[PDB]
Structures are given as C-alpha cells and as structure tokens.
Design a binder for these strands. Structure first.
Lengths: 57, 135, 76, 188
RNA sequence: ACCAAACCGAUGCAAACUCCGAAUACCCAGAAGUGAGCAUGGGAGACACACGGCGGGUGCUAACGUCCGUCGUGAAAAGGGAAACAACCCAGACCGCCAGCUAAGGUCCCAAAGUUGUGGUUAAGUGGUAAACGAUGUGGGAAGGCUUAGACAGCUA
RNA sequence: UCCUAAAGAGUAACGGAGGAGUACGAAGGUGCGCUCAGACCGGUCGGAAAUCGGUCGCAGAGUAUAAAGGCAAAAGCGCG
RNA sequence: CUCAACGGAUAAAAGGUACUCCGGGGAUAACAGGCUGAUACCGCCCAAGAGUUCAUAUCGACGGCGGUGUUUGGCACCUC
RNA sequence: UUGACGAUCAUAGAGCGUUGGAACCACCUGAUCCCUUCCCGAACUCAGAAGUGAAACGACGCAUCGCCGAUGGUAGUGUGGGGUCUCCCCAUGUGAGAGUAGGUCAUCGUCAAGCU
C-alpha cells in the first residue's frame, strides 16, 4: 500500500544530499503531505531524512 | 635524563592524545603500582623528581621499575623572533600519558609504606594518579 | 638547511574498475612497477603500463602461487 | 562459589551499554565443548564477591542460567581500564573428559627464614606468578606451594625445581623452555 | 668483581615503520517514483575573502594568529531568539487584513503567556565566573570492623 | 622521490627530509646456461676477516646513478 | 641561448637623495588602544634539607597549579 | 600398483616415524663414437645393462612448529543532537584487530598404465 509523509523541518540549512532526498519524494514546503508508493526505494529515502519527516502512517 | 641514544629523525609532528590505554594498564612486575587517571604529557624532568622521591622514602630495599619512556622531541622558538622562519630547536623530551597507564611499580615493601611513598611521587607529577594492586 | 622542492604529482592510479567495458587501447592502470601483473588479455607496456588488446569486461583476480594480482579481461 | 544468570536476547553496542548504566548488569557468554555458545547477563554486585575471592580463578563455579545448572570455570576478564571494574565475563563449560587449561596462583610459603636471608644480607624477588595448569577437571589445583627458605644467596629458582602434584603437567616444560621463578640477591 | 653482543621469556612506542584493517568517499552497471544533461555561439562579472563546525601543519595543541581539506552561513537575507550581538540557533519577505495554528525561546513584575501538578535535592544568594589542593558540609549506595560474655566515651589506679 | 595529503585523482606554508644539469657501441638485441648475503666447522706464511671444502640458508644480497614502488618466464650473474 | 629571474622584456644596463617631488594605502611599519601571556610581577601546593637538637620562628633545593595586565614580546582588527 | 600434464595456492607447509620394487623410476657401468667442461663425463650428452631401493622419490602415520579460526565483548566511524567543549556522551546505522573454544598430516581433472 501507501504511506503518508509530512515535512516538519525546513530545507535551508541542510546538506546538498538530504535536500535532494526530500525533493525526490515530492515535498515542496513545510506541512505538505504526499502519498508515496511504499517500495524498497522510496522508504530508503525516508531513512536518510528521518528527522525532517513525520511518517504518520 | 631519559632520551634515546640515536634517532632516525630530528623533529616530529604534534598529533593528538586520544583514546584510553588497554595495553599498559596491567601491573606486571611489582605488586603495587601508581596508574594514571587523567590524560597529559610528562616532560622527563618530572620523572627524575618523582624517581628521586621514591628512592629515599624506602632507604632499605625494594625494586623500582619505570614503565614509561619519553621519546617525543618538542621544540620551542627563542624569544624576540617573528613567526615563520623554520622550526625551533629541540629543548626537551616528552612521554604521552592516557587514562589507565601505569607509571611506577614497587615490590618488596609494605603496602602502607608504599602507599605513603607514592603520595610523595604524585605531588611532583601533573596528573591525577591512583593506587592499584596486583591480580 | 632549507628545504622546499617537491615534484609535480604524476597522476598515477587505477582506471576502469570491476565491471567496465573496454576497447583495444584503454589503459586500465598506470602503475609504478607491477602492483598488478599482466593477466589473460592485457599488455604490460614499457614502464609497466597495462593496456587492453581485446574487448570485454575487467576482472581483477588473485591467482597462483606468490599470490599475485592478475588483471584479465573476460569476453563477457 | 555460586552465581545465577539470565538470558540476554539483545545484542549490540547500544543495548550492551544500556545494561551497565540502567540496570547495573554485566554481559557474559557460556561457550563449551558439547553445545553452542550462549550469552548471559550477570550483576556487577555479585561478580564483585567472586573476583574478591582468592582461589576463585582456578576453581569450579556452578552457574544458574535459568534453572539450568552447569559447572563453569572462568577463563577471561575484560575489565574497564580507566576506572577499574568488571566488563563482560567470558567463561567456560566443563566437560568430564577434555583436558583443560587455566592459571594458578603461587604462594612462596616459607620465606621468613632463608639461608640467603639470615646468613647473608638477603632479598627475595618474586619474578613470576600466575603459572598455568594442564590438568584433568576432576581434581583441581587451587595453588602451588613453593619454598625458598632453603639454599642460597645467589641462586635462581627454575620451573623444574617446583613440583606439580598428583600428575599435573606444566605447559612451559611442554614447550622447550624453563622460566626462572624467584631469585635471592644482595640489596643496594 | 668488567661489562657486554647474540639467543630465550615477559614488557612499551613512531608523520617520513607494516603480518593486518573498517566506516565513509569514489567509479560502472539495475531498475521504480519525483524534478534542466551535453555541444556550438553572443555578453559579462570574478581572480583582497570573512567566521563557524569537523579532520590537520605551524605556534605555547596561545591569539577575532597564519597556511590547507570539506560542509554551512555572511558577502548578496530581512523577520523571531541570545539584555544590546553580519558569520551562533529558528526561518527564507509579491501585495492587503483590528483573522487562526506553530518553530527555536519561554510563562512572579518591568514584558505577551502556569505564583500549574508530582517526587526529591541545595542555605551558599550556590544558582548568577576558575586550578592544583584542603575539610566530622550534607543526600544516596554497597562494605566491612567490634558489641548486653558489657564495645566505644567518658570518671575512676 | 618520500612525508604533510583526510584508504580514487588533486591540494598550501621562508613546513619536515634528500637528489639531478649525466653515463654506456655494451652497461643495447637474442639464444643458451647459473644463483644471494650472511652463520658457522676444516684448512700452508693472511687470519676478527682474502682463496679452497663443506653443511645451514629460504633475498636479510644485487639493481651504472637519490629515495620510493618492484623483481624465479628472475628486471640479478656469465658466455656465443 | 644559463639574465639557472630556468613560459625566456633588448644584440647590448650599476648606485645615491637628510635638497627632494606627484599619485595612492591603515591591502602595510614606528606612538597610543585591542586580542594573547611565552616573559614578567604576586601567590599557592609537596618538603630534601639548615635553623647546635628540632622541615614549617625564619628560609626551603628538586618539581607542580594559578592570578594581575605592570615590561621584553607575538599578531596586524581601528586611524596615513 | 606408477608415470606425464594440469586445477587450487599452507586447513595443501616443515619436522619426526614407517615403507615401496624388478613393471615404472632412480642411482649405476663406460666414453669408443655424438657432445661437453674460462680445469674436471660433476653438470651437459651418447651407447647400456648387470647391481641396488642405500641415497633420492612416492605412499602411510604423528598437531610437536607453522597455518587457518569461531561466538561474545571492545576500539574506531556516517547522519541527527548534547555537555564540565586541547576530550567525551545520547539516539540510530555500521562494526574490526588482538586474544579464546577449537581446527588442519589437503581436494580434484586428463591420458598412458597396475584388480583396474
């Protein structure tokens, strides 16, 4: 199935690598919630940027 | 004092003083020892102040071992000299201590004679040392 | 008494790693005297520069007595 | 000599350090001849009584893992170098027939009156201790008595001189060597 | 009574010492999803850098010292926090509103919001600057040592 | 050429250490052969150490020239 | 071909100025400030000893931990 | 029963001990004749067995040296945050080296040739 994510930190003082992990998921700004198809590659990007995110189910 | 006879090089980097001491922390020869519980570096004149303190509070017998040996030369530019013309000359020699390392060992004495003898040698060293036994 | 004077850093290395595809003149390893020996389909030029002769995939295998490093190119 | 243990189904660096500050436990393993190695938690308040004991290193200890009972001999102690306290224990199952290897304390029992000490101005310098053993687990050597009361100012004592009782070998004579044990010499 | 190779055993240490040996970073291949590579032309500006974090040289492991490697912020970024405080935390301003929920930081009075609930601790105004070192300050946790056969103190020879 | 240099390349300092401004007509090609230093014991005037014989070796030698990386198809040694 | 000042200004090049002059600079020095304390100056810890005996009435070798910014410095942030 | 050519490079090595002939193999006899020695039939080569398994070589045994080597713990380290901040700690991913229990007197392939 799917899983919804929530961007809860900013993107501005971050690395060049975590700032592309979040853009690869499709998050644009804070409190923007998308649906990803939960594959081994989408939830690989979540493990890098776990602290910017809120995986609420 | 204590220093090498001939050295393959003349000067050396600074480096760092990291980690604990896993080898060097076990008493091997004596039955009592003075191990060091704070990191620092000893400058090879402190060793002869601490050695000549233990050897006159015994007066009778005992055997003394000195576990640590300074081999690291340390430089110092002379006064009234601007910076950046080379590297200064070697003034003295340094050993590098890290917590757990055993400094002195003693055997053939009483424990309460020796406990109040390492009190004298600890007041000459810039480290916080402790008293340990042989197991 | 005074000592600056370094040299200018020849750019040695190992190109063309474990699964690459090659041609016939590729170089695969500069070298400094036989870290890697001439395997199956490679050249070993003048100053011990390896090079390819046929086409395929690099291997980097350890073989034989003396345990020497053989760079061979496999037609795969 | 008795301890009692638990199972410890949490392995790592993180879970192993939380044992020591939260609960006060000490990790351990039990590995032996017949079975698999099994990990174990013990307390730091208990092992403290056994490590304070004298001959407890070269002696058999009964371990209560669950209600599981096993005769266990201890051959390792990893110990914290800075402060000084016990870290994981690493001991051994005891089979009724597989040889064994441990270390044994010495005592130097009679050195009050030695001919090197009373006649000439004497000193006795114990070089070695903790000599090993190679025995059969049925009959244990707790210690070995050495007597340097006897002959000389100016003789060293080898490993060949002192005797291992009831048919126990010494590994250092099994290798081609014979270490010196104790000296008698003049003081400075 | 000299010393002292060499050899056996225990024992330490190297940027210019290695029987070994990671994490990361690099390359090339595979795919899913989300959102801008190469080549040829026109026009430039720059080539005095600053601090901070993590690895280092030099220095006295001194300087908001100085030369490098890498990420971030100033430069070229306002707003809120640190009493005032480019570069440290938070967050990136298209414009209007006498609308609502939040981040770091906070809730006695200057000063917007708890004189909130619970369990202990410190009496020094510690909080609200600091070193070897010293001491019947106190709270907790395992220890032992001796003791109604009379211990320790005390007054009794 | 090594170190600083952070296990790809690269990378500074009036930062630590050293070397070149050439030799060779065989010191090149090729075929054929062959192994070091040292240890030790025996041996005429050497004698701690020359040549010879022997056992042990297991690259600790050698490489035209600095150091680094190498070398049993020996890249080391000899002859046509 | 050695400006070997090794990407090499010309075939062919030394010095003075307190008699000096123009254009610039706190990108850069001497005075005072500023950060820093190696050096200083004031202390304090162990106590070998001498002080006839007696380490602390007075001193205290061998060595360690600080404070003040007072002078010899380090750096070059302000002002040419 | 052996002999050749490989595969794999020590868990395959070294040491000790045992053991094999008339098929193989090795030593062996003589150099006249090929051919060889900076001297030498030593090595190289040729005509050849008798003789022998001594040496050598293969097999069969021993873990005495060597060599491999767990599990657990520990060092270090990527990202996020801490603190008393020349050094460490917390959450999370990763995880040696050394040592311990123990292992190892190899395993195969192609032909000629010995039950075969």
């Amino acid at each position: 199935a799917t899983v919804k994510v929530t961007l809860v930190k900013s993107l501005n003082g971050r690395l060049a690598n975590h700032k592309a992990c979040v853009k690869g998921l499709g998050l644009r700004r804070i409190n923007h919630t998308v649906e990803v198809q939960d594959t081994p590659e989408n939830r690989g990007m979540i493990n890098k940027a776990y602290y910017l995110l809120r995986v609420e189910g | 004092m204590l220093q090498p006879k001939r050295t393959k090089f003349r000067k050396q980097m600074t480096g760092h003083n990291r980690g604990l001491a896993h080898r060097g922390s076990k008493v091997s020869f004596g039955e009592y020892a003075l191990k060091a519980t704070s990191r620092g570096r000893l400058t090879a004149r402190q060793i002869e102040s601490a050695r000549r303190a233990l050897t006159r509070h015994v007066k009778r017998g005992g055997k003394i071992w000195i576990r640590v040996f300074p081999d690291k030369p340390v430089t110092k530019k002379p006064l009234e000299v601007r910076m950046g013309k080379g590297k200064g000359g070697v003034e003295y020699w340094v050993a590098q201590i890290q917590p757990g390392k055993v400094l002195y060992e003693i055997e053939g004495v009483s424990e309460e004679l020796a406990r109040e003898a390492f009190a004298l040698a600890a007041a000459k060293l810039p480290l916080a040392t402790s008293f340990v036994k042989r197991t | 008494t005074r000592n600056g004077r370094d040299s200018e850093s020849k750019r040695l290395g190992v190109k063309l790693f474990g699964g690459q595809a090659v041609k016939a003149g590729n170089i695969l390893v500069r070298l400094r005297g036989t870290k890697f020996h001439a395997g199956y389909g490679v050249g070993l030029g003048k100053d011990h520069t390896l090079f390819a002769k046929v086409d395929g995939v690099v291997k980097f295998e350890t073989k034989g007595a003396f345990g020497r490093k053989y760079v061979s190119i496999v037609a795969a | 000599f008795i301890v009692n243990a638990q199972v410890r189904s949490d392995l790592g660096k993180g879970a192993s350090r939380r044992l020591r500050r939260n609960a006060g436990l000490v990790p351990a393993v039990v590995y032996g001849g017949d079975k698999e190695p099994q990990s174990v938690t013990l307390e730091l308040r208990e092992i403290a009584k056994l490590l304070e004991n004298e001959a407890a290193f070269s002696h058999v200890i009964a371990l209560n893992v669950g209600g599981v009972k096993e005769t266990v001999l201890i051959k390792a102690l990893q110990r914290h170098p800075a402060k000084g306290f016990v870290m994981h224990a690493d001991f051994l199952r005891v089979v009724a027939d597989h040889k064994l290897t441990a270390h044994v304390p010495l005592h130097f029992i009679n050195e009050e009156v030695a001919v090197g000490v009373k006649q000439a101005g004497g000193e006795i310098s114990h070089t070695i201790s903790e000599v090993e053993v190679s025995c059969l687990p049925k009959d244990l050597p707790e210690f070995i008595e050495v007597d340097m009361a006897k002959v000389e100012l100016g003789q060293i004592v080898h490993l060949s001189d002192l005797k291992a009782p009831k048919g126990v070998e010494l590994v250092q004579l099994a290798h081609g060597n014979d270490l010196a044990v104790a000296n008698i010499h003049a003081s400075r």
